Design an enzyme around this catalytic site. Structure first.
Site, short mmCIF file in Angstrom:
data_model
loop_
_atom_site.label_atom_id
_atom_site.label_comp_id
_atom_site.label_asym_id
_atom_site.label_seq_id
_atom_site.Cartn_x
_atom_site.Cartn_y
_atom_site.Cartn_z
N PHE A 181 0.65 -0.90 0.02
CA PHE A 181 0.01 0.52 -0.26
C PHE A 181 1.08 1.22 -0.03
O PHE A 181 2.14 1.43 0.99
CB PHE A 181 -1.30 -0.41 1.23
CG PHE A 181 -2.54 1.15 0.97
CD1 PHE A 181 -3.54 0.85 0.14
CD2 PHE A 181 -2.17 1.71 2.09
CE1 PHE A 181 -3.86 1.31 -0.25
CE2 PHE A 181 -2.92 2.71 1.46
CZ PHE A 181 -4.47 2.64 1.30
N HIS B 23 0.94 7.87 2.04
CA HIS B 23 -0.63 8.57 2.37
C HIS B 23 -0.69 8.92 3.55
O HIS B 23 -0.27 9.06 4.40
CB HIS B 23 -1.59 7.10 2.37
CG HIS B 23 -1.81 6.40 2.93
ND1 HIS B 23 -1.39 5.99 3.03
CD2 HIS B 23 -2.97 6.69 4.37
CE1 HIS B 23 -1.23 5.01 4.55
NE2 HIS B 23 -1.99 4.90 5.19
N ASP C 138 -3.69 9.77 7.24
CA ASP C 138 -4.88 9.16 7.37
C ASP C 138 -5.57 10.49 7.04
O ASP C 138 -6.36 10.96 7.08
CB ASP C 138 -5.05 9.12 8.61
CG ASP C 138 -3.20 7.26 8.52
OD1 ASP C 138 -3.64 6.66 7.60
OD2 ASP C 138 -3.35 6.45 9.64
N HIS D 169 3.09 7.18 5.69
CA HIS D 169 3.56 6.06 6.02
C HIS D 169 2.97 5.52 4.59
O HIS D 169 1.96 5.65 3.83
CB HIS D 169 2.66 5.74 6.93
CG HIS D 169 1.29 5.98 7.52
ND1 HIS D 169 1.09 6.95 7.31
CD2 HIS D 169 0.38 5.29 7.54
CE1 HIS D 169 -0.32 6.95 7.90
NE2 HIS D 169 -0.72 5.59 7.60
C1 LIG Z 1 -2.59 -0.17 8.60
C2 LIG Z 1 -3.29 0.23 7.64
C3 LIG Z 1 -2.13 0.99 6.99
C4 LIG Z 1 -4.36 -0.51 6.40
N1 LIG Z 1 -4.51 0.40 5.01
C5 LIG Z 1 -6.00 1.54 5.73
O1 LIG Z 1 -6.88 1.29 6.25
C6 LIG Z 1 -6.18 2.41 4.23
C7 LIG Z 1 -4.51 3.31 5.29
S1 LIG Z 1 -4.90 4.22 6.19
N2 LIG Z 1 -7.48 3.18 4.95
C8 LIG Z 1 -9.02 2.87 4.02
O2 LIG Z 1 -8.41 2.25 3.04
C9 LIG Z 1 -9.59 4.04 4.32
C10 LIG Z 1 -10.59 3.06 4.67
C11 LIG Z 1 -11.77 3.57 5.05
C12 LIG Z 1 -12.80 2.97 5.39
N3 LIG Z 1 -13.72 1.12 3.85
C13 LIG Z 1 -14.15 3.04 5.45
O3 LIG Z 1 -15.94 3.85 5.17
O4 LIG Z 1 -14.08 4.50 6.64
C14 LIG Z 1 -3.02 -1.72 6.28
O5 LIG Z 1 -2.04 -2.38 6.14
O6 LIG Z 1 -3.46 -1.02 4.89
FE LIG Z 2 -3.25 5.27 7.30
#
Ligand SMILES: CC(C)[C@@H](NC(=O)[C@H](CS)NC(=O)CCC[C@H](N)C(=O)O)C(=O)O
Ligand SMILES: [Fe+3]
Length: 329
Positions: free
Chosen positions: A209, A212, A214, A268
Site C-alpha cells: 500500500f 498516504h 490518514d 506512511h
Molecule cells: C494499517 C493501515 C495502513 C491499512 N490501510 C488502511 O486502512 C488504509 C490506509 S490508512 N485506509 C483506507 O483504505 C481507508 C478505509 C476507510 C473505510 N473503508 C471507511 O469507510 O471508513 C493497511 O494495513 O493497509
Molecule cells: Fe494509514
C-alpha cells in the site's frame, strides 16, 4: 540503508482516571511523539487484543466466496449500490492479495435520521449469517464500542497535549453520530505471490500500500506481529516496529488541518511482506456536521485563519481521493 522510527510506548491508563497531573504527563508524551515521527504505541489500554485477533482470524478463514459476494461493497457488486463503505472488500487471486471487512457505527439503523435523510458516508452495516459465523456480529459490535472507549480517552490526551480542556475533541465523538469505522484486514501468505499485488516505490521498496496521510482525526490500529509499516521523515522512510500488544496511534489529516499542521498527519506506507497477518484499524471520525475551529499552538494568540472544516465533507472527499490515489482496496 533503512533506519528505525522512534515509536515510544506510552502508558495511556491515566487517561481513564482522575489523576489530572498524571494525565498531563501522558499528554506531554503524546505531544512529544506527535511532533517527532507522529506515531506512538498506546500500552496498558485495557482491550483484550488476543480475543480481537482470534475472532478476526476465525472470520477471515471461514467466510466463503459465496458469502463474500453477498456482502460485497459496490466496487465488487453492482447490486449493492448503497455499500460505499461497509461490507466485504474482495481479493482477486493472481492480482490483489489483500481483503477486508469494514463496518460502521452499529447505531446506523433504518430508524436513524441520517439514514432516513440519505446523508453521504452513513450506511447500515451488513453482516454474514449468524449460524455460519456464530458470535461474530456480537464480537464485532462489542469491539467497536471497546475501541471507541479507548479512542475517547486518547482524544483527551491529545486535547490536553495541545493546551485545551480534555473534552475539546471528545465532545464531538459520540455514539449516536460517529462516522468511525473498523476494518478487519487480512494480508495473506501466498506462494507464489502475485507480482501485480506488489507496487514498487520511487525508492525501490516493494509495497503493499503506497504512501498516504490518514483520513481521520486519529487512527487507532492493532496489527499482528509482522513488521510492515514505514513512516516518512526528512531523511527517508523509517521502519515502524511491530507490537501485537499495543495500539499504534497517529494523527490524521483532519488533526493536521485544525492544528495549523502543528501535529502533522505522518505520511506512511505498507511494505510488501509475504506473511499471513492482520491489520485492524479503527478510524476515529467525528459526526457528519462536526466542526472544530482551527488554532495555531505556535502563536501567542493561538489564532489561525484556516477555515473550519465540516467533518462529513472532509471524510467524503478524503475517502474518494484515497481510492483514486492508492487504488480500490
Ligand atoms: C494499517 C493501515 C495502513 C491499512 N490501510 C488502511 O486502512 C488504509 C490506509 S490508512 N485506509 C483506507 O483504505 C481507508 C478505509 C476507510 C473505510 N473503508 C471507511 O469507510 O471508513 C493497511 O494495513 O493497509
Ligand atoms: Fe494509514
Amino acid at each position: 540503508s533503512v533506519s528505525k522510527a522512534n515509536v515510544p510506548k506510552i502508558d495511556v491508563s491515566p487517561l481513564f482516571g482522575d489523576d489530572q497531573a498524571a494525565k498531563m504527563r501522558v499528554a506531554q508524551q503524546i505531544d512529544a511523539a506527535s511532533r517527532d515521527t507522529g506515531f506512538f504505541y498506546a500500552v496498558n489500554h485495557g482491550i483484550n487484543v488476543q480475543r480481537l485477533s482470534q475472532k478476526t482470524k476465525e472470520f477471515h478463514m471461514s467466510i466463503t466466496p459465496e458469502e463474500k459476494w453477498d456482502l460485497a461493497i459496490r466496487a465488487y457488486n453492482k447490486e449493492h449500490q448503497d455499500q460505499v463503505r461497509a461490507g466485504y472488500y474482495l481479493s482477486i487471486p493472481g492480482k490483489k492479495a489483500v481483503e477486508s471487512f469494514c463496518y460502521l457505527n452499529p447505531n446506523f439503523t433504518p430508524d436513524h435520521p441520517r439514514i432516513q435523510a440519505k446523508t453521504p458516508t452513513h450506511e447500515v452495516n451488513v453482516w454474514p449469517d449468524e449460524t455460519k459465523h456464530p458470535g461474530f456480529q456480537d464480537f464485532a459490535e462489542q469491539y467497536y464500542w471497546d475501541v471507541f472507549g479507548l479512542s475517547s480517552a486518547l482524544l483527551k490526551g491529545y486535547a490536553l497535549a495541545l493546551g485545551k480542556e480534555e473534552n475539546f475533541f471528545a465532545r464531538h465523538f459520540k455514539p449516536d453520530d460517529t462516522l468511525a469505522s473498523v476494518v478487519l484486514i487480512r494480508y495473506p501468505y501466498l506462494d507464489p505471490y502475485p507480482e501485480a499485488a506488489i507496487k514498487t516505490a520511487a525508492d525501490g521498496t516493494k509495497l503493499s500500500f503506497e504512501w498516504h496521510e490518514d483520513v481521520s482525526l486519529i487512527t487507532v490500529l492493532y496489527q499482528s506481529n509482522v513488521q510492515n509499516l514505514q513512516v516518512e521523515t526528512a531523511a527517508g522512510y523509517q521502519d515502524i516496529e511491530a507490537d501485537d500488544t499495543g495500539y499504534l496511534i497517529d494523527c490524521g489529516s483532519y488533526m493536521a488541518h485544525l492544528t495549523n499542521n502543528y501535529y502533522k498527519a505522518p505520511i506512511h506506507r505498507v511494505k510488501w511482506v509475504n506473511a499471513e497477518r492482520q491489520s485492524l484499524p479503527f478510524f476515529v471520525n467525528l459526526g457528519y456536521d462536526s466542526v472544530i475551529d482551527p488554532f495555531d499552538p505556535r502563536e501567542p494568540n493561538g489564532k489561525s485563519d484556516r477555515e473550519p472544516l465540516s467533518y462529513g465533507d472532509y471524510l467524503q472527499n478524503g475517502l474518494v481521493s484515497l481510492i483514486n490515489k492508492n487504488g480500490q482496496t
